[PDB]
Amino acid sequence: ANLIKRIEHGEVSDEEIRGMMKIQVQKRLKWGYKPTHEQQLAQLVTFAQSLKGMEMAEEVEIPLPFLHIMCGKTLKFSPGYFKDESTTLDESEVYMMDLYCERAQIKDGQSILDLGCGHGSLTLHVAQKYRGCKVTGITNSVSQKEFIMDQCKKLDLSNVEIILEDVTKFETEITYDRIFAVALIEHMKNYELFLKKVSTWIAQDGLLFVEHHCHKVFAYQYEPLDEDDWYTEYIFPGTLVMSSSSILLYFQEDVSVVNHWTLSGKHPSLGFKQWLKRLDDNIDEVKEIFESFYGSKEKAMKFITYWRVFCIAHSQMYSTNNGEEWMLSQVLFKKK
Amino acid sequence: ANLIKRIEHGEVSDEEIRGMMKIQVQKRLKWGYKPTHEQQLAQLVTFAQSLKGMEMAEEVLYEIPLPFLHIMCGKTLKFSPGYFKDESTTLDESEVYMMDLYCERAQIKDGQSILDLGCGHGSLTLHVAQKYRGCKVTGITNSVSQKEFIMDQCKKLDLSNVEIILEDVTKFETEITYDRIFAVALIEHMKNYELFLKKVSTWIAQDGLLFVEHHCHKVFAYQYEPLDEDDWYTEYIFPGTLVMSSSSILLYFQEDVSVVNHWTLSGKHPSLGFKQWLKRLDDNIDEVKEIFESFYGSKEKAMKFITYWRVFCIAHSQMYSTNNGEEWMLSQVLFKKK
Numbered sequence: 001a002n003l004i005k006r007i008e009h010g011e012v013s014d015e016e017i018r019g020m021m022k023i024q025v026q027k028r029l030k031w032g033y034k035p036t037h038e039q040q041l042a043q044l045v046t047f048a049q050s051l052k053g054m055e056m057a058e059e060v061e062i063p064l065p066f067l068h069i070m071c072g073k074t075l076k077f078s079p080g081y082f083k084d085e086s087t088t089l090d091e092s093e094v095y096m097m098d099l100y101c102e103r104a105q106i107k108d109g110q111s112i113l114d115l116g117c118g119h120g121s122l123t124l125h126v127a128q129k130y131r132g133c134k135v136t137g138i139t140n141s142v143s144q145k146e147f148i149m150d151q152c153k154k155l156d157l158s159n160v161e162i163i164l165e166d167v168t169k170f171e172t173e174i175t176y177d178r179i180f181a182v183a184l185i186e187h188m189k190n191y192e193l194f195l196k197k198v199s200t201w202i203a204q205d206g207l208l209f210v211e212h213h214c215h216k217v218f219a220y221q222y223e224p225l226d227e228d229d230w231y232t233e234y235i236f237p238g239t240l241v242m243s244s245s246s247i248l249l250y251f252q253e254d255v256s257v258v259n260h261w262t263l264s265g266k267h268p269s270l271g272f273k274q275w276l277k278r279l280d281d282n283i284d285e286v287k288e289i290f291e292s293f294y295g296s297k298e299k300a301m302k303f304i305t306y307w308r309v310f311c312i313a314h315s316q317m318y319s320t321n322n323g324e325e326w327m328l329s330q331v332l333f334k335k336k
Numbered sequence: 337a338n339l340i341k342r343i344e345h346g347e348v349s350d351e352e353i354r355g356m357m358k359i360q361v362q363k364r365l366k367w368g369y370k371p372t373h374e375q376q377l378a379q380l381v382t383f384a385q386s387l388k389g390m391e392m393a394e395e396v397l398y399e400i401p402l403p404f405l406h407i408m409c410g411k412t413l414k415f416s417p418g419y420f421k422d423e424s425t426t427l428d429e430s431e432v433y434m435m436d437l438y439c440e441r442a443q444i445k446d447g448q449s450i451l452d453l454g455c456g457h458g459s460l461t462l463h464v465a466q467k468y469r470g471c472k473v474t475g476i477t478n479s480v481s482q483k484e485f486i487m488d489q490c491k492k493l494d495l496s497n498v499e500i501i502l503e504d505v506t507k508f509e510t511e512i513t514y515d516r517i518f519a520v521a522l523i524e525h526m527k528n529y530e531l532f533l534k535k536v537s538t539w540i541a542q543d544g545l546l547f548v549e550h551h552c553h554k555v556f557a558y559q560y561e562p563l564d565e566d567d568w569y570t571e572y573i574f575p576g577t578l579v580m581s582s583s584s585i586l587l588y589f590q591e592d593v594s595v596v597n598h599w600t601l602s603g604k605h606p607s608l609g610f611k612q613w614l615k616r617l618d619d620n621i622d623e624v625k626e627i628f629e630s631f632y633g634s635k636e637k638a639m640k641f642i643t644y645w646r647v648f649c650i651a652h653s654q655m656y657s658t659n660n661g662e663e664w665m666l667s668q669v670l671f672k673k674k
């Protein structure tokens with residue numbers, strides 16, 4: 001309730017937001033797990049059917065210099081692969097993206113489509129590693145597209161096209177040898193309408209690669225458990241879907257699964273720790289950026305606080321049980 | 337290997353067999369479960385992929401005398417689990433409950449055409465055909481006497497709506513399509529599920545559905561390879577590389593069919609059914625001996641075959657009961673044409 005403003009204040013230590021989050025982790029686990037497999041399964045199946053009763057996505061801008069501080073060279077807004085705790089944020093971005101390339105079976109000369117390309121992390125990585133490829137990225141953000149185009153000029157890249165559109169409404173009669181959808185489906189609800197649409201963009205014998213945060217076992221809409229659930233109200237003021245690792249297996253009407261992998265929650269957990277450290281290491285430069293963009297020192301402090309809590313809360317949540325609760329799922333599809 | 341001989345000569349008590357099986361399941365569980373999800377998933381995906389490079393089924397005198405099945409199995413001769421809504425539910429009731437459950441989850445309606453793959457002695461074929469006089473039910477079997485048994489049930493019950501095709505499902509070809517297809521305890525005999533589901537899916541009519549029930553472990557899948565050199569159960573019961581599916585392995589075989597629904601049922605149900613079989617066998621052991629002595633021509637072969645059946649029932653009752661029935665269990669999957 002009034003709990004947050006005390007922290008916008010700076011009144012509980014990290015250690016105690018960490019402790020609040022563990023309480024919410026456990027209450028979500030208690031809610032989600034069932035005494036028998038018959039129930040566990042019935043609840044996932046029932047949950048998938050209800051997703052087919054929704055819209056594809058809710059019908060609903062971070063300053064670039066702040067992202068240059070928090071994210072890493074590549075402006076990758078999504079997890080890295082950490083071989084160690086000694087892996088740097090920026091090695092982790094590159095590692096995870098080569099992992100994508102290997103699992104999606106990217107080859108030089110393929111046409112490639114990057115749905116929700118953001119600041120072009122993967123779009124620029126693919127385009128530089130395979131100059132024979134023609135890479136098309138889709139974003140609904142003019143700021144992101146002009147930034148990416150600015151990098152293409154800089155690095156001297158001529159194999160990159162950026163279409164400005166809502167993926168939800170994008171229509172084309174061009175098909176692509178490979179399609180990427182990394183951390184997009186977190187923004188979707190009717191997985192069935194989304195995969196149906198994307199499937200018509202897949203070329204003959206093409207592949208769609210999808211990566212999504214998930215719980216290992218159960219799925220759910222972000223809506224408070226208790227009266228005491230601050231974290232959903234605060235982190236997510238516009239409801240969205242935390243998927244489960246296996247839930248896209250139930251959405252194979254227009255695409256078929258070729259391969260399926262998961263990665264431990266330690267990877268996003270580590271990533272979020274690096275985001276928090278870089279934030280706090282440059283905290284003064286961050287306050288200046290936020291004052292300029294948001295117009296006041298108070299509203300700036302509100303956003304710095306939001307981001308620290310986001311990183312703190314989610315680093316803890318994904319570390320749960322050595323990363324074996326919330327985690328990453330990767331799915332390779334072909335058409336039809 | 338000399339274990340078996342002393343079993344067959346009636347040394348090793350039922351509790352020793354039960355204890356042996358417990359050891360065997362704990363090795364299987366410890367072989368199968370992995371310390372991380374990424375490994376667990378990788379085991380399963382990799383095992384699924386390897387199935388796609390196999391035969392649909394292995395190629396093959398191991399038929400069961402029919403009077404023995406009348407004793408062991410129960411009124412409809414269902415050779416697959418019953419549903420026990422309790423421990424007071426009888427064998428005969430479990431069969432009818434389970435088969436009504438099939439009729440509801442597969443959405444059967446009067447007048448539909450129905451194909452029953454691997455119909456056995458026709459438990460489901462006859463139950464559906466007696467329940468829905470407007471349906472035409474086609475059963476497929478590779479067994480001459482299973483087909484002749486069913487056509488005689490049709491004579492006795494005065495059903496004109498049942499047709500049995502004598503054929504190997506793996507090789508059968510037809511241009512007919514059906515509103516409803518059943519495959520109950522059939523994929524336990526299959527290896528390449530992909531090739532199997534491809535063939536079958538051509539038999540599904542427009543808006544038709546396919547209902548598959550299979551035994552499985554909850555999490556991981558494997559072939560019956562012996563685990564170590566202490567493993568007697570595997571090549572005693574399965575000497576033919578059959579496959580133990582996992583509850584979700586068919587989610588990875590959706591190239592020609594799409595999942596409409598997916599359920600599991602506790603291993604308690606198959607556990608109690610095997611117990612029921614064992615009781616009826618023991619309660620009629622003299623008649624069983626006679627039936628086997630007659631049909632296999634030996635006192636020796638007869639004891640070997642009674643032993644095998646009792647071991648099979650004791651061991652599988654134990655395995656399916658493991659951890660309150662939450663390890664090995666039943667999976668039911670409903671598919672539409674893709």
Ligand SMILES: C[S@+](CC[C@H](N)C(=O)[O-])C[C@H]1O[C@@H](n2cnc3c(N)ncnc32)[C@H](O)[C@@H]1O
Pocket residue numbers: 057075076077078115116117118119120121122138139140141165166167168181182183184187
């Ligand atoms: C957390 S992700 C990051 C994207 C990119 N895969 C990456 O790793 O940086 C969110 C992205 O999805 C994009 N997005 C969400 N909904 C979209 C839509 N309907 N059309 C286009 N882009 C969308 C947003 O613009 C944002 O860049």
Ligand SMILES: C[S@+](CC[C@H](N)C(=O)[O-])C[C@H]1O[C@@H](n2cnc3c(N)ncnc32)[C@H](O)[C@@H]1O
Pocket residue numbers: 393413414415416453454455456457458459460476477478479503504505506520521522525
């Ligand atoms: C465990 S089931 C029992 C049958 C029946 N579906 C039931 O639930 O009572 C096994 C049946 O599959 C049949 N079967 C196995 N492989 C077959 C094949 N390739 N072609 C035809 N029938 C087959 C066998 O004849 C056997 O009766």
